[PDB]
Design a protein around this nucleic acid. Structure first.
Ligand SMILES: [K+]
Ligand SMILES: [K+]
Ligand SMILES: [Mg+2]
Ligand SMILES: [Mg+2]
Ligand SMILES: [Mg+2]
Ligand SMILES: [Mg+2]
Ligand SMILES: [Mg+2]
Ligand SMILES: [Mg+2]
Ligand SMILES: [Mg+2]
Ligand SMILES: [Mg+2]
Ligand SMILES: [Mg+2]
Ligand SMILES: [Mg+2]
Ligand SMILES: [Mg+2]
Ligand SMILES: [Mg+2]
Ligand SMILES: [Mg+2]
Ligand SMILES: [Mg+2]
Length: 204
RNA sequence: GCGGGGUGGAGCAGUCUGGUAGCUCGUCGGGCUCAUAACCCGAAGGUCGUAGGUUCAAAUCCUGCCCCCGCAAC
RNA sequence: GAGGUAUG
RNA sequence: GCGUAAAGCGCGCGCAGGCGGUCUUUUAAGUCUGAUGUGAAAGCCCCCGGCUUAACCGGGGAGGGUCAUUGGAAACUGGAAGACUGGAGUGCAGAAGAGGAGAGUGGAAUUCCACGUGUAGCGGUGAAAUGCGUAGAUAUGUGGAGGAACACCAGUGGCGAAGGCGACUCUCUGGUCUGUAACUGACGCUGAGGCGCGAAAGCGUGGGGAGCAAACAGGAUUAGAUACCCUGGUAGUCCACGCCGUAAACGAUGAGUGCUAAGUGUUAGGGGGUUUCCGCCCCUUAGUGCUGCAGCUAACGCAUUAAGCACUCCGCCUGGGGAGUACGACCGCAAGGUUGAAACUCAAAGGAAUUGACGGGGGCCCGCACAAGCGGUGGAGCAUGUGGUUUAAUUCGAAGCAACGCGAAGAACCUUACCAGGUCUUGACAUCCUUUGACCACUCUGGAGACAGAGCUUUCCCGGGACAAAGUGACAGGUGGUGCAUGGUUGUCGUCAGCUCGUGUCGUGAGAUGUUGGGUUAAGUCCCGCAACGAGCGCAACCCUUGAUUUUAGUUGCCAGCAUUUAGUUGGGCACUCUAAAGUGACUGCCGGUGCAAGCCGGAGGAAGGUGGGGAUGACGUCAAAUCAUCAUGCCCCUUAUGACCUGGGCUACACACGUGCUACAAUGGAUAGUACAAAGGGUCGCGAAGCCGCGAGGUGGAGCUAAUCCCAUAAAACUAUUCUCAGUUCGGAUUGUAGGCUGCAACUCGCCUACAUGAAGCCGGAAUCGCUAGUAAUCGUGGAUCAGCAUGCCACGGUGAAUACG
């Protein structure tokens, strides 16, 4: 069959939407502003392990919280990275900006991060067995009560495609008391695109 | 030259007894079926070889021609 | 458990 | 190697040959052994040497014979002379038997003949019909004729070499088993080549011929039916004699001997213990069957009736097909049989077993699947979509369920990708370089416009920043392709209850187990049991909504107790609603019955009872299902054009077919008037009030409202009155003409709505076919999105409100 996006199934249930504001007459403007913002962030901070972005609006200021595993790149030895960010984001938004940077602990408990790991591996021509399995073991060591992954594409350069999925632990997608994380990431290959999907069942 | 004939696409009636378009197969359409066939439901398709006559009216009665199948002639 | 009495 | 894969003659009688019980003596045919002689050289093999090594060459040795002669051994085979008995056979005492041939005999029972009674059918099928029958059946009784086979007994029971043999009696005959140890003393096992027997069909001659019955005839069936099916019916079937000599002739398993656990029937015998025989028990022989240990087997399975362990003998196999054919021979009256190839061709053929799928196989369970019912489609008109067609173009995609009111939640231009025309090429759209800086905006002219000519006029801001004109190549761009390279998204089986896995165990193994079974449940839900124990995905539940209620808060909502207003109005108050946060409650939780238990049925309380109702929620995977036209995307292709702009056109065509819907075909109705009760929703340059003008569509106007305040917004069906009186109608409302209104630059192609007139088809829908089990179907209006305008479509809303479920 076809599965529902297990995040979308849980918005307004146990997860809060990431784009947080109220608006009227300003809604589309703020939305597409913040989509441009996420494009900027993903474009210039894919390397930095950026994995979640929550937006906030009040008093015209563009408040942001970037949850990342390595802060030391978003900030760090210079102190000028976040200032560059708010400068260019001022140029876009035509507003004020402020940017908190949160440290994620257990970076292998975020499906987005894990999917980027696997995707960079598969672009570097690593085996799609070892990739999935090592990501799984890293999660279950990092503290996941459940893990699941799959890859679909021209696996290994085939003509015909298929899917390879592997799971440890309890991963119930029909339960909603589940705190599940999910992600989909894309890898490029000289043969074509590979779709990596991940989802994690977490502690409490 | 002598016999048969020429009527929807095919085969056959109906002509002798002027008004009557028929039987079987087929065709087209719609159903049944995953699709074709079969089956069920409806419909179309012939101015009766042709040109003239007679008649109120001709597939039908009269005449000439043109074709096909046989038989003769060659 | 055994023996018999239309098509693709 | 021969049960099932190729392979046991169909079975016997038996010449030849092969093989042969125990012991003593004799030999030395075979066997074994010492000696001598030879088996040439070259070559293989080993050891040395020589050619620059190697190849090659030389020297020497060794090996090699079912070799021969001579001399020795007697264990085994063989020959010879004796002896013995467990084999083999005769005798003796018993027992069974459908063993065979002949002759005769019995009664059931089918048919036929005659005669009574006797009246209109009988027969047969899925329905029939052909056929028999008033010239008298069918049936019923009596009597008679003729033939064929022999119920019960009768049984994986008997016998036989096999084929096969069933009514009884007699005659003539064969073989088997049991006991004895009398008799002979290995006389035996097999058995090529021969000889005979040998189901049924069939052949020749002559009888018989009742039934059944190939062929055949007629009737049905069918698309056709040279068939199944029906009614008739010749050969035959039966006998005598003689041929034929085949078989799924099968236990698909050659004859013989011995050995290697058991349990149990059954047949024919014997022996013994006990007991009044009877009866029970045990031991044993030859059969016949069931189940099973070892062992064998690819497995299935065989298993003292081996497919085990061993020996003798025979027959047969060597991939499938051609081919059991051809030539040839033998046999045969013939039909044909026995023996038995090749060329050529294939890359497999095949056996057993496993997993599924399927089944005009079975069983159990479920779903609007049927059935029961309600209302519909197919018929008419229109809207929409699709096909075919015609078109300059009629963009592209979707195609059984799972395409076709689908992408499109809006085709006038734009959209729009297509067509015609007119144009541009670093471009309509981005980065990097170089020059410059506001770029531009508005007017005029030629224009269909894009676009060209001019003008007026471009203020960049503090080297930097942001955007901009021109050069300039790198690049751009492609709704160009491939959804059979892809991602992601989606339907679908199916919200069906199933799909799997770790460890363990069984199996050579694939695979199985678990996951089956007995119950139960909506559910691989849950219990009991089990070589499995457990887990994961799913199911359920957690979520939202509806259904009752407590506390909080009472305005923009409510109005009871109160006054008062045209108005719940104003004051006042949250009583009650309403709103919406946190709680409660419904969990088989309790009682009765039954179950062992899970659970099932009933009962109570309560608003709600049995996952309360409804949602979302869609497992591994199937259809290489759809999507390169949402997006991204590998490869390929175009890149002064498959790219880009503008105008106009087409996507709305029209002989015709399908789907989906709207409108109706009327009296449970229509026209006219009055008139009660909704929910869910939307609104800022948007909703748009009141009042007014206009028949009306609408115009005017601008109140109030960024909204529980105000508006969109009379809700319509319902009800009440009057009329129409069952009619192609005051039904129906198309189509067309004229005139209006909106929207938008613009309404011909090609919008919607109004007024007047016209008044079309249609008087309940062929074969077929669809939704629905409850506030559902049906029916009525409302709202929202998209949207300037453009809906019978889509998604939500409430109003009214059924029928039925045997199964
Ligand atoms: K005969
Ligand atoms: K037999
Ligand atoms: Mg006539
Ligand atoms: Mg078939
Ligand atoms: Mg065989
Ligand atoms: Mg020599
Ligand atoms: Mg015979
Ligand atoms: Mg029904
Ligand atoms: Mg219709
Ligand atoms: Mg099309
Ligand atoms: Mg596909
Ligand atoms: Mg396609
Ligand atoms: Mg569920
Ligand atoms: Mg396909
Ligand atoms: Mg269209
Ligand atoms: Mg029922």
């Amino acid at each position: 069959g076809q599965k529902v996006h297990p995040i979308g199934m849980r918005i307004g249930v146990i997860r809060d939407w990431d784009s947080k504001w109220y608006a009227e007459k300003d809604y589309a403007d703020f939305l597409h502003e913040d989509l441009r913002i996420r494009d900027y962030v993903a474009k210039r901070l894919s390397d930095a392990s950026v994995s979640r972005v929550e937006i906030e609006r009040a008093a015209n200021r563009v408040n942001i919280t970037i949850h990342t595993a390595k802060p030391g790149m978003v900030i760090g030895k210079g102190g000028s990275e976040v200032e560059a960010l708010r400068k260019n984001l001022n140029e876009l938004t035509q507003k004020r900006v402020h940017i908190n940077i949160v440290e994620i602990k257990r970076a292998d408990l975020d499906a987005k991060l894990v999917a980027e790991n696997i995707a960079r591996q598969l672009e570097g021509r690593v085996s799609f067995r070892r990739a999935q399995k090592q990501a799984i073991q890293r999660t279950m060591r990092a503290g996941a009560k459940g893990i699941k992954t799959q890859v679909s594409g021209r696996l290994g350069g085939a003509d015909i495609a298929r899917a390879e999925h592997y799971s440890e632990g309890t991963v119930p997608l029909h339960t909603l008391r589940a705190d599940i994380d999910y992600a989909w990431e894309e890898a490029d290959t000289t043969y074509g695109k590979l779709g990596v999907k991940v989802w994690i069942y977490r502690g409490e």
